[PDB]
Each structure stands twice: as structure tokens, then as C-alpha cells.
Amino acid sequence: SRTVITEVIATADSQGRFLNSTELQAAFGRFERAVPAIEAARALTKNQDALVKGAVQAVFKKFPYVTQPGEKGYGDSNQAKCARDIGYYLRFITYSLVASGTGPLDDYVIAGLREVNRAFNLNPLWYIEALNYIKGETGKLLSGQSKTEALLYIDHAINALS
Amino acid sequence: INLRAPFTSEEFQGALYAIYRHIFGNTYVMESERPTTAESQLKDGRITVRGFIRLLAKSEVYKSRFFQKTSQNRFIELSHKLLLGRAPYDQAEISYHLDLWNTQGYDAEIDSYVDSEEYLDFFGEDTVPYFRGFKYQTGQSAEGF
């Protein structure tokens, strides 16, 4: 996936050359930022269930018209799939935090996102609201830099959805 | 890789590396075989990536490695792979290109690849060719992959 180290190696390889000062300094930055990013992922993993339940509830509060009979938000299967989707997004956000790159998101979620959402008539706004929630509670869950990395990745997901 | 007209030295050297790795089928090209005049023309802006590729395909490196010791079948499939990034879709391509070379020579055969609508749609004067056929292409024949 597209991370700092993998981009470094891909650029070095595409030009057929070794790793020089620039590439090693980039990798050094990755290895320093690993600490805030990894423990932000730890904090996000710990509070995953509450975050997912709250994101689903926020979707329903903003979109009450999905849950009454006849459309996407109705039924135990649909709501379970909603929980599954928000958990997917959170999982890949934590993956991206650990890997220090949007490679997990870009490769697993964002690639093909619009075609899939169009085919199944899933509104991207639902997931935008869920991720905005996730952002709200990661603001209070996380402090200092960890908050910063988690916000960068959550917002990359949001931007891709919008 | 895309190479515009104002380009830096590192971008230029990387583009040359990519172009040689693709257009020459991952074959080792020696320092004595590298085209310095064509590289100068590309560096100036006199030709594009496309015209540079056309030059390289008309060059003795390409001819010797892919034309002069092969059958025309191997040359046609290999030119499809290297200049279009895809495989031939049917036997009509083989017949068409064989007749083209026989009646109009090797240069016209290269020009068909490089002046093709496929090439211009996907690479278009500034991007290095790449392998497309590892993804579904419209009009593909399911055996092209």
C-alpha cells in the first residue's frame, strides 16, 4: 500500500537508483511520527464499539427518513450493514494510522467507492455524517498530535466520500 | 510518468529510465547504444514523449531486438505489448500489420502504432506507455488479458 516507506522505495525504484539522503530523511520522519499515530490507533481500537454505535445513531438522527419502512435504513439487516460499514471505515482509518499512509484507505475503501455506492444506492452523505461524528469523539478521545493524525486520516476518508 | 515541456533534470532522467525500461522490454541497453541526439531533441522540446518513442521504435536497438531475428507474428505481438501496453485482440490485427509492413515498410508500421487512436487516448504525446491490459479495456476480447 501507499505509505511513506513504500512511496520512497517506489520513487527510488522507478528511477532505478538506491536510497539517498532525501528518502532516508522521509523514512526518519515516518519512524518518528509512528508513536503518536500508533497510540492514536490504539485509542481508536479501544473505543471502537462506542464510536460505531454513536456514528450509526448520528446518521439516523441526521437522516430520520431512512429508518421508517420502505427504504435503505429500515430493517435489522440494513442497520447491521450500517454498523459493518462504519466499522470498516474505522478499521481502515486505524490501519492507515499504523501504516503512516493513506494506502489502506485508498486501496480498500476509496478505490471503487463511487461506482459501488452508486450501484447499491448508498448515499455518501450518510458516511460523511458518520465520519464527522467519529471526528467529534476523536477530538475528545485524543490529545496533542495523535488527535492530529487521526483527524488527517478521517478527513481524507471524508474528502474521498465528498 | 508524464513529461511536460519545462522539466527538471531529475524528472528528465527518471522519464528516460522509465522509457527505456518499457520500450525496450526490460532489456539491458548499454551506454554506447543510448540515443544522445534524440535525448537532446526531447530535452529541448523539439519532440514530445510520443515522437521520442517513435524515434526509439525506429532505432536500431528496437529493430535488432524485436524485428530482425523474429517472425512478423512475434514482432506484432511484441509491438502491441510495448507500444500499446496491451495484447492483440484478434487475428485481424496480425493480418493488418503484416500487410502494412509488407506494402509500406517498417516506419509506416511503427507510425500506425504511435499515430493510433488508442495510443493517443491513453498516452497522448506526454505520458510514457504503460501496461494497460492488466485491467479491463473497453473493446477487449477477454483473451487479451
Binding site: - | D115, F122, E125, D126, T127
Partner: protein
């Protein structure tokens, strides 16, 4: 001989790209290409088919 064709795109190319979608990276409209006499006609037809506008051709 060799002829320099200065090309422009004032909307026919634009609408063709709008229908087909951006498919190689976007580039500026006005640009010039040098073409030999042997390739002069096919390049001209290709530009006309693409919706390109040629503002002038110079012989050198």
C-alpha cells in the same frame, strides 16, 4: 520538408474530453508540433478529427 503546426483547442476538443473523461493528465490548449512532410497529412487529419484548431502552419 518539416512544418510546424500551432494547435489550439477552443471547445470541440473540450467537449470531446468532457464526454470521454480526462484520461491522460490535463494539458494547456495552445501548443506547437513539428511534423515532416511524410507525416504531414495524417497529423492534419488527426487534429481535425480530434476537434483541434490549427491557428497557423509554418514551413522551414
Amino acid at each position: 520538408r518539416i512544418y510546424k503546426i500551432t494547435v489550439s483547442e477552443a471547445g470541440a476538443y473540450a467537449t470531446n474530453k468532457h464526454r470521454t473523461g480526462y484520461r491522460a493528465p490535463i494539458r494547456q490548449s495552445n501548443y506547437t508540433l513539428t511534423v515532416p512532410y511524410d507525416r504531414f497529412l495524417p497529423e492534419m487529419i488527426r487534429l481535425h478529427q480530434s476537434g483541434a484548431k490549427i491557428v497557423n502552419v509554418t514551413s522551414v
